[PDB]
């Protein structure tokens, strides 16, 4: 048994892929699919959902309205199915708990039993070879059970997320509690401390508050090599960037264009942290100013330049630039807020390496290949170079999603 279509990951980037899917079978028939998550119990970010996240996105911008309003899976349908329209409204906010957003991620899902396979995690793709052409694709994935599964299908799609970035002076300590990514936050701090937030971005931001709330135990330092917290910027001329209509504008610029059109829009995304957010940081400063009780330290100008392990703590040789000093800090705790990498060759698309090709993945978002490769390979979220900002983003995804099952379909028949 061949599948039309498997995916990497049930992710917020393939559920909305999932749902466009179920829209085309009406008119153009149901493929067999099936979407492996590595989740068991599926939580968005789940080691990330503290007290007050807040979506970054506006709820609008959720995983069918941009396409189709009237798709019963909208964020707004999904309070109306859990009786909490009228609620949210005297909200008055654009811009849901990150918890709740979960919620309806979920509650989305499980309209897909049938496709999900959730526990599982996919290892590699191997070609399937007849005539030396690639007829089908192998997807061997392993369970949480430790049992490894092999299925076969005449499609892939990729959409794993990210992975999260070391600094290479930390690299060393991989493997030790005591220093650990955000991402996976709420599972190391469940195990009076002195911890430290490398980087300025939100994922930093949102570590710090959270200790500071939740742990009054705690005394962190964030350690900014930047000067200062950068505010996310999302002003309606500029947030124009992460429009539908900019993807195919990007997408025809040269190299050149493309690179300065992010590096112009960066700060939309990357390093920037919540206006709101910045304040209450520095309100936080600002307090301890008054009390004169230093619990906390905002290192900006900061560079971690040694990083080693002890019986006592964790020991960072600081530099700080301005003072040109170089000073030692000792933490009981590590936090690397230091982001995601998406590279999309990793060690699970290897066996294909041979067939895919040197230009850039598809304006259909399928990566392009050898005439000896039949089947289709897709990616969502590894085209940032060449799609825009709206790439690693929930942004698009309900466009984003028309265009692939669009693709599939026409590969298929
Ligand atoms: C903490 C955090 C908050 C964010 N908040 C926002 C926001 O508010 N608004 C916004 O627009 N964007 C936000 N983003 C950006 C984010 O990338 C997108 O919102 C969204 O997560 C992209 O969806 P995705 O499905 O493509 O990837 P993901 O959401 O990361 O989905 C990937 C899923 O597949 C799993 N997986 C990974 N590798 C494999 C594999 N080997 N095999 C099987 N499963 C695998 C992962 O565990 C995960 O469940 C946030 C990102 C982070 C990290
Ligand atoms: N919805 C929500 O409430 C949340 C959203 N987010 C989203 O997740 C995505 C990524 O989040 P986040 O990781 O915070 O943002 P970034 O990945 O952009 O921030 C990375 C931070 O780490 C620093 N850094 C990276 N490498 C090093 C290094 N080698 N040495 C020292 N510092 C380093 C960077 O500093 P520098 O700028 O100087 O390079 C930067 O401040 C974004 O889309 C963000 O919006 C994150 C958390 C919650
Ligand atoms: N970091 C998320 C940015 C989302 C973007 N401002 C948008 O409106 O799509």
């Known amino acids: ?77 999904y309070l109306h199915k859990h009786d909490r329209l009228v609620d949210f409204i005297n909200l008055g906010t654009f811009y849901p708990c990150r918890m709740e957003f979960n919620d309806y ?14 526990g599982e995690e996919v290892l590699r793709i191997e070609p399937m070879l007849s005539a030396g052409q690639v007829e089908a694709l192998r997807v061997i994935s392993r369970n949480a059970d430790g049992e490894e599964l092999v299925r076969t299908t005449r499609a892939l799609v990729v959409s794993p997320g990210g992975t999260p970035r070391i600094p290479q ?39 710090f508050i959270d200790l500071n709330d939740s742990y009054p135990s705690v005394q962190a330092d964030m350690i900014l090599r930047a000067s200062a917290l950068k505010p996310a910027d999302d002003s309606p001329f500029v947030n124009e960037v992460f429009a539908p209509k900019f993807t195919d504008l990007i997408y025809s610029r040269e190299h050149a264009e493309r690179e300065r059109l992010l590096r112009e829009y960066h700060n939309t995304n990357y390093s920037v942290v919540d206006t ?34 002890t019986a006592q703590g964790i020991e960072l040789a600081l530099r700080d630039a301005g003072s040109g000093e170089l000073s030692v800090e000792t933490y009981d705790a590590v936090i690397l807020a230091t982001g995601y990498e998406r590279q999309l060759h990793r060690q699970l698309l290897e ?63």
Not at 105 to 118: D, I, K, N, P, T
Request: net charge neutral; proline share 3%.
């Open 276 to 309: 709101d957010l910045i304040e209450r940081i520095y309100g936080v400063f600002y307090r301890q100013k008054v009390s004169g009780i230093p619990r906390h330290a905002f290192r900006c100008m900061t560079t971690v330049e040694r990083a080693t392990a």
């Open 169 to 207: 002076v930390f690299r060393a300590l991989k493997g030790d509690g005591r220093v650990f990514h955000h991402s996976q936050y709420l599972e190391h701090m469940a195990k009076p401390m002195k911890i430290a937030i490398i980087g300025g971005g939100q994922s930093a931001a949102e570590a």
């Open 351 to 413: 066996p294909l390496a041979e067939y895919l090709g040197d230009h850039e993945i598809g304006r259909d978002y399928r990566l392009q290949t050898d005439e000896r490769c039949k089947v289709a390979i897709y990616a969502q979220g590894f085209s940032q170079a060449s799609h825009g900002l709206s790439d690693t983003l929930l942004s698009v995804l309900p466009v984003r999603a028309e265009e692939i099952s669009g693709s599939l379909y026409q590969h298929l028949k």
């Open 105 to 118: 991620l979920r509650w989305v899902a499980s309209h897909f039993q049938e496709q999900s396979r959730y």
């Open 1 to 77: 048994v061949v599948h039309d279509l498997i995916g990497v990951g049930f992710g917020p980037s393939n559920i909305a892929l999932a749902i466009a899917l179920q829209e085309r079978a009406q008119a153009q028939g149901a493929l067999e699919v099936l979407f492996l998550d590595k989740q068991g119990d599926y939580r968005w970010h789940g080691n990330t959902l503290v007290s007050q996240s807040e979506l970054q996105i506006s709820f609008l911008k959720d995983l069918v309205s941009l396409r189709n309003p009237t798709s019963p899976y909208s964020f707004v349908n």
